[PDB]
Design an enzyme around this catalytic site. Sequence first.
Site, short mmCIF file in Angstrom:
data_model
loop_
_atom_site.label_atom_id
_atom_site.label_comp_id
_atom_site.label_asym_id
_atom_site.label_seq_id
_atom_site.Cartn_x
_atom_site.Cartn_y
_atom_site.Cartn_z
N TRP A 128 -10.86 2.37 -7.47
CA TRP A 128 -11.62 1.92 -8.93
C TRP A 128 -11.07 2.92 -9.88
O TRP A 128 -11.21 4.13 -9.92
CB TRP A 128 -13.17 2.26 -8.68
CG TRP A 128 -14.02 1.93 -9.65
CD1 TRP A 128 -13.92 0.38 -10.13
CD2 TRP A 128 -15.07 2.58 -10.56
NE1 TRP A 128 -14.98 0.61 -11.16
CE2 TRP A 128 -15.82 1.74 -11.20
CE3 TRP A 128 -15.66 3.84 -10.34
CZ2 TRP A 128 -16.80 2.13 -12.11
CZ3 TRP A 128 -16.60 4.41 -11.00
CH2 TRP A 128 -17.19 3.44 -11.92
N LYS A 141 -26.80 -2.57 -9.83
CA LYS A 141 -26.47 -3.92 -9.14
C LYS A 141 -27.76 -3.92 -8.30
O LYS A 141 -28.11 -5.31 -8.31
CB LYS A 141 -25.11 -3.80 -8.49
CG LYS A 141 -23.72 -3.70 -9.14
CD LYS A 141 -23.44 -2.24 -9.24
CE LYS A 141 -22.02 -1.92 -10.23
NZ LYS A 141 -21.62 -0.75 -9.71
N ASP A 152 -19.49 7.51 -3.43
CA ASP A 152 -19.88 6.72 -4.67
C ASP A 152 -20.72 5.59 -3.95
O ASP A 152 -20.15 5.10 -3.16
CB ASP A 152 -18.68 6.37 -5.21
CG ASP A 152 -19.01 5.69 -6.34
OD1 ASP A 152 -20.15 4.94 -6.80
OD2 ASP A 152 -18.11 5.36 -7.36
C1 PLP Z 1 -20.59 -0.25 -10.35
C2 PLP Z 1 -19.99 1.07 -9.75
C3 PLP Z 1 -20.09 2.33 -10.34
C4 PLP Z 1 -21.50 2.66 -11.12
O1 PLP Z 1 -21.73 1.94 -12.22
P1 PLP Z 1 -22.98 2.46 -13.19
O2 PLP Z 1 -22.87 1.19 -14.19
O3 PLP Z 1 -22.35 3.38 -14.04
O4 PLP Z 1 -24.04 2.52 -12.54
C5 PLP Z 1 -19.59 3.46 -9.44
N1 PLP Z 1 -18.65 3.34 -8.66
C6 PLP Z 1 -18.24 2.10 -8.32
C7 PLP Z 1 -17.00 1.92 -7.10
C8 PLP Z 1 -18.96 0.81 -9.05
O5 PLP Z 1 -18.21 -0.43 -8.66
#
Ligand code: PLP
Lengths: 396, 396
Positions: free
Chosen positions: A130, A246, A211
């Site tokens: 990511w 999510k 994470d």
């Molecule tokens: C969606 C996501 C997050 C955190 O998203 P927030 O909108 O900041 O809560 C963190 N790490 C990954 C790999 C994600 O896909």
Amino acid sequence: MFENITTAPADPILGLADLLRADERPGKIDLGMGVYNDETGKTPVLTSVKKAEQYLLENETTKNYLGIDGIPEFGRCTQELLFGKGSALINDKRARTAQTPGGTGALRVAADFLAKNTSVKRVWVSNPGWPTHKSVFNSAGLEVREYAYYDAENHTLDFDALINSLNEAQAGDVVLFHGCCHNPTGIDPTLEQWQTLAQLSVEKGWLPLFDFAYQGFARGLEEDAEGLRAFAAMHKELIVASSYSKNFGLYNERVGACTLVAADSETVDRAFSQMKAAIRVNYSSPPAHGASVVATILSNDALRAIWEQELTDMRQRIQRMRQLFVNTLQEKGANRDFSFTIKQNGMFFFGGLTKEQVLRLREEFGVYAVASGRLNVAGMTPDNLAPLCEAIVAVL
Amino acid sequence: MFENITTAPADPILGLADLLRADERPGKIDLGMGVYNDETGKTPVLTSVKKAEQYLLENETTKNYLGIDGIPEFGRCTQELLFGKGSALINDKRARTAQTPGGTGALRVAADFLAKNTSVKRVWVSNPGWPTHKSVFNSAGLEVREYAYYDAENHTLDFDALINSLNEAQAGDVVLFHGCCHNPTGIDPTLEQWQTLAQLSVEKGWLPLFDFAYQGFARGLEEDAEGLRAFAAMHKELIVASSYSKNFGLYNERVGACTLVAADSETVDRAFSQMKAAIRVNYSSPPAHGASVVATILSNDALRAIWEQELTDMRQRIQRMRQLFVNTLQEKGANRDFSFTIKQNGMFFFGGLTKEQVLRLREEFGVYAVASGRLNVAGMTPDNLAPLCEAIVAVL
Ligand SMILES: *Cc1c(COP(=O)(O)O)cnc(C)c1O
Ligand SMILES: *Cc1c(COP(=O)(O)O)cnc(C)c1O
């Protein structure tokens, strides 16, 4: 003062929103950001959430500042969800949780905390991974090194390459793992692999950072946390950046958490005081609404039951779309087999397109995806599935 | 990794919350943090706010991510409130606003933006001032220099010392001003002084940064912004960190804004792209609830009328408490004249106590205040006024 400022490079993921804005074509299909959509192509407010907001509207009597670390109940519920109802970390008071503005905000707090209070110099992230991870850690002054993870030819986790890659990681280094639903591969370690990684981590002396943004989207709430709990059982110290964006559909309310774990209550408290100092000079205290909704739901048996069912339905719809996607590709003439997408956990589909193919899908078909070839399966509906596949079959 | 982390020093302002928590005495009087209280000693949710939240509960259909800069309507309303309905800055599109997690969050975004994209090395803040300012700018790697401001003997703005102090400020330096309701002196520049400061600022080549957290608490919404508008009329570039925490009683929802102003639309856009990049690696996008409430109210004539009246009532109650405080001190035997507090704008009372007196008030009387001698007048009620003054008269 601003005459010489250079325009900033667009974000590979968030930048799609702006491009979609400008495109005035009618049949645009947004498969970029990881946001859930129902059969109608809408991203609705969960029913359990609406009820929690109803409750807050009627019982909330003040908007007075929360403490630097947020709502206490929120922290306890987050810990239970992560480590398990009767975990030893909870009993021994080895964990401290700070409510943060989203999972990304949690990562930033962790990064600032690390850079200023420890000797950490490097953070290891997966490749593919990511993009926001490098950006956040780099902005805090830490260097990012990448470790191998995916077998692009077999569409599986290349464990040997992973182990071999991390051997260059020295003790005191931070190694970042995706709790579940690896972004973007969708391929997660098996319980046995997680156990081997935990074991290895303890010997090498790494500081694990998890994470956790998709708890509940792979198999279930408790199952998705087994990897993390495997590590928690053997490590004296660790960090967890989780998100409720999510699994609660609270994307724009910015509800996340940064959990710190130390050898004992005395040590975590001292360390946590410094984490609070990092927050103090950032946004001071966290936004209450979103976290309040989460605390209310997890604390109320009734609401929690409704919420767990809604989460289950979301995971199930995505799983059904994967089949429909693969099937529709076969009957549309796809000259390639995309059945490996069925094994991928989470919201995405990955590993079958080149950056050029993604570019052509956009320019010629109005289909939007990340340049890495990551498509948001959660964005696919029975209505846009046909034209979507027709476009894909045309660029293969 | 955390064995050697040292405990962090308590925050002189936010730290009071923890001390209050531990004190189990019944008659505690909290005059620390700048939070409004009504006659009953409670910090209620504004009625206009409750109605806005009612509206959102019924019309909101998604919690999908906001753009990095937040709700667009929020930005426009914030600009109108700051520069005036038909301002040239708005017409010429010289201003860009990013919704932020509170005014403190706005300051952090501004600091990160400055440190990474400009040659700014120093930020000038007043003394006495608000401690959080140094903390935030220092955390971004910028040095803080202090400028004189208060005549402690006459309880007025020492303009000569201010001008003389800023002469050591070089072109390219950032100078921070409190829009109105100077924290903690409560003494603001007159329109003529603001005009002289704007004039001087243009010649010296300073980058003005306005912290605007109390718009509407001095005299009125439009009146409180005349200083800022004086500067905006002569400067090509400037920054404004505003907050809705107090004038909307949305403390814990973290509603603030960072407004950037450049010579032209082309320049502000390029610069703003970098400000968005600073946010991107922090919390990504802002929490919607609070800002949504503010946008809804300022956009609805009915709600806005109710809100302006509530703000007016808050300002008026504080003004009445100042008189009652001074009067009650005289009839309680105070051997000193605290009438100069009547001229102070805002929520606080300042300039009459030593740090020892504040310490004694706490330990012996359960009265809590900032070690600097700043008391929250907004925390005084007809009920706690008598015992409060008795305690004060005992330490003079
Ligand atoms: C969606 C996501 C997050 C955190 O998203 P927030 O909108 O900041 O809560 C963190 N790490 C990954 C790999 C994600 O896909
Ligand atoms: C209250 C205040 C702020 C901003 O407060 P937030 O709670 O972060 O919105 C900023 N500057 C001063 C001087 C303040 O008093």
